[PDB]
Design a protein around this ligand. Structure first.
Ligand SMILES: CCCCCCCCO[C@@H]1O[C@H](CO)[C@@H](O)[C@H](O)[C@H]1O
Ligand SMILES: CCCCCCCCO[C@@H]1O[C@H](CO)[C@@H](O)[C@H](O)[C@H]1O
Ligand SMILES: CCCCCCCCO[C@@H]1O[C@H](CO)[C@@H](O)[C@H](O)[C@H]1O
Ligand SMILES: N[C@@H](Cc1c[nH]c2ccccc12)C(=O)O
Ligand SMILES: N[C@@H](Cc1c[nH]c2ccccc12)C(=O)O
Ligand SMILES: N[C@@H](Cc1c[nH]c2ccccc12)C(=O)O
Ligand code: NA
Ligand code: NA
Length: 504
């Protein structure tokens, strides 16, 4: 079986998986919509009681399975619990990263697309007023994506947006087809430093920003001013736990597969803890010091609220681009911005596709070349539903990316720490550990963490699913139909995998 060459590589790869567009976009927005500085209370609490606990578990499971030639949950779940229902539940852990990938690479292709357009200075040029500046860029984005102009839920991406998507896929293939060490690990060692560098620069530059409407200091101030009255709101503790789950890429299956290439006795406690720490610093320190400070510096705190409610997407692809077109060398700044995000996405998309690759290699005995190519094929084809059908992206992101990950996280906890055996799991976690997990996490993982994930799934599902299932256009069934098919497909492959094992 393949393995990570170095300890630095492993950590950087794992960290690259967790660091994404969310670090520089979603976090700042959430933190602002949930009490600024006060949001650090439920955020930190969730990181210690959910993020870290679950993270180690996925490392543990991943490594556990890797020692037996299995890097995916259909087999790993079976190993932790020899029951056919464990194989079916394991399929769900392979379905999620596949579906997510189907829409994520495309999203990533956007950043590469914009980075290019900005680099070469092919962008809108206002003109005065905010609406006047924003509209040109709002339309710049809409033209790229192909936002519907009619009542038909049809998207029509630009030829350029399509071609860039092909290139993005090609870049992912190039890295993946070289394997774990010479491909993923190798690229991580370059991407992370480049990422960190680009972030730092952007941080410095933003702090210099001064307009009649305000400064970067105003933005940071607003963002970090604690509103201790919002902590009462349960919806805040839900946004916090959700933000941690998101930023750590938990329940997505990526971590398990990466961890399956960790040697039988190679530490996962310190390695995992460090990987997480890296992501956190990139999120709060860097991510919180760019987008929002910039938006507030340019539009004044008078719109800090509105802009925050406008969403992370608008913030990263519309508002900031517009801000850049009004600052000195802003166009080359936009480049660095989207360049930053592209590497943020890339280090995740390669991780989000490895699971499907690992399955083909481990269970169907496909060469790495064939596995990667077929995986690229499946995702590339499937992506066309996301590119051309409006709101398909949202549907996949919901069931798989959102619902799926929280449900699966709870499943992991229970199978590992309850079915498999708490003590067995605990030793399975601490074994080979450079450092040992504080004896207190035993109870956290066994009761506290599952309890949390349950409340999150439940309290949140009550005020979520009803909408999607009722207040949506009928075309959502196209997407639901397709992704359900993918689940069937994967269930079939698993069937074929277990039949092959019996034959040999
Ligand atoms: C089925 C797998 C192969 C892809 C089938 C071709 C569909 C892609 O269609 C492409 O869409 C782009 C974006 O709207 C357009 O700009 C291009 O003109 C068009 O060729
Ligand atoms: C590598 C990324 C740049 C290459 C992609 C360029 C393709 C988009 O090029 C576009 O093609 C359209 C259809 O022919 C024309 O109508 C547009 O004028 C032209 O800009
Ligand atoms: C030099 C390598 C990169 C070439 C950049 C090609 C991408 C340009 O893309 C072009 O942008 C124009 C203005 O936004 C649009 O009007 C065209 O429809 C679009 O194809
Ligand atoms: N970790 C990503 C979010 C994320 C969660 N699961 C994923 C799966 C694939 C890609 C990204 C993700 C971020 O910080 O923004
Ligand atoms: N669905 C969320 C993003 C997301 C994906 N997976 C998640 C897990 C937890 C919280 C949020 C997410 C959004 O619309 O932005
Ligand atoms: N468990 C120790 C020693 C060890 C066992 N197997 C390893 C494989 C690689 C590196 C170290 C090890 C560690 O992770 O450091
Ligand atoms: Na992150
Ligand atoms: Na990444």
């Amino acid at each position: 079986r393949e393995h990570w060459a170095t300890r630095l590589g492993l950590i950087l790869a794992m960290a690259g998986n967790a660091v994404g567009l969310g670090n520089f976009l979603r976090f700042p927005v959430q933190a602002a919509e949930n009490g600024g500085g006060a949001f650090m209370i439920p955020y930190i609490i969730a990181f210690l009681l959910v993020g870290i606990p679950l993270m180690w578990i996925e490392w543990a499971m991943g490594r556990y399975g890797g020692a037996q030639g299995h890097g995916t949950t259909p087999a790993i779940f079976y190993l932790l619990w020899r029951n056919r229902f464990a194989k079916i539940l394991g399929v769900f852990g392979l379905w999620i990263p596949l579906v997510v990938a189907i829409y994520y690479v495309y999203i990533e292709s956007w950043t590469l697309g914009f980075a290019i357009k900005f680099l070469v200075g092919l962008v809108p040029e206002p003109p005065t007023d905010p609406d006047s500046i924003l509209r040109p860029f709002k339309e710049f984005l809409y033209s790229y994506i192909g936002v519907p102009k009619g009542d038909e839920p049809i998207l029509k991406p630009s030829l350029f947006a399509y071609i860039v998507f092909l290139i993005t896929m090609f870049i992912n293939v190039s890295i993946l087809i070289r394997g774990i060490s010479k491909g993923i690990e190798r690229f991580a060692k370059i991407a992370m430093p480049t990422l960190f560098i680009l972030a730092v620069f952007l941080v410095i530059r933003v702090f210099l920003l001064e307009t009649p409407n305000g400064t970067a200091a105003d933005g940071l101030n607003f963002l970090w001013t604690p509103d201790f009255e919002k902590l009462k709101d349960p919806g805040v503790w839900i946004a916090a736990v959700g933000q941690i789950f998101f930023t750590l890429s938990l329940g997505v299956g990526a971590i398990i597969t990466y961890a399956s290439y960790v040697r039988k006795d190679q530490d996962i406690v310190l390695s995992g803890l460090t990987a997480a720490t890296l992501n956190e610093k990139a999120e709060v320190i860097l991510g919180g010091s760019i987008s929002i400070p910039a938006a507030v510096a340019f539009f004044g705190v008078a719109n800090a609220v509105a802009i925050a409610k406008a969403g992370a997407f608008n913030l990263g692809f519309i508002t900031l681009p517009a801000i850049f077109s009004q600052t000195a060398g802003g166009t080359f700044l936009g480049f660095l911005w989207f360049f930053l995000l592209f590497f943020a996405g890339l280090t995740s998309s390669i991780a989000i596709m490895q699971p499907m690759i690992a399955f083909l290699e481990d269970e169907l005995k496909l060469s790495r070349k064939h596995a990667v190519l077929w995986t690229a094929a499946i995702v590339f084809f499937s992506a066309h539903l996301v590119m051309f059908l409006n709101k398909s992206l949202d549907e996949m992101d919901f069931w798989a990316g959102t619902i799926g990950v929280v449900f699966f996280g709870l499943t992991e906890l229970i199978i590992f720490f309850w079915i498999f055996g708490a003590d067995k799991a605990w030793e399975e976690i601490n074994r080979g550990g450079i450092i040992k997990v504080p004896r207190i996490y035993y109870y956290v993982m066994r009761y506290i963490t599952p309890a949390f994930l349950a409340v999150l799934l439940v309290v949140w599902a009550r005020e979520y699913i009803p909408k999607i299932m009722e207040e949506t256009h009928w075309t959502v069934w196209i997407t639901r139909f397709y992704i359900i098919g993918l689940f069937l497909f994967l269930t079939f492959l698993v069937f074929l995998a277990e039949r092959r094992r019996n034959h040999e």
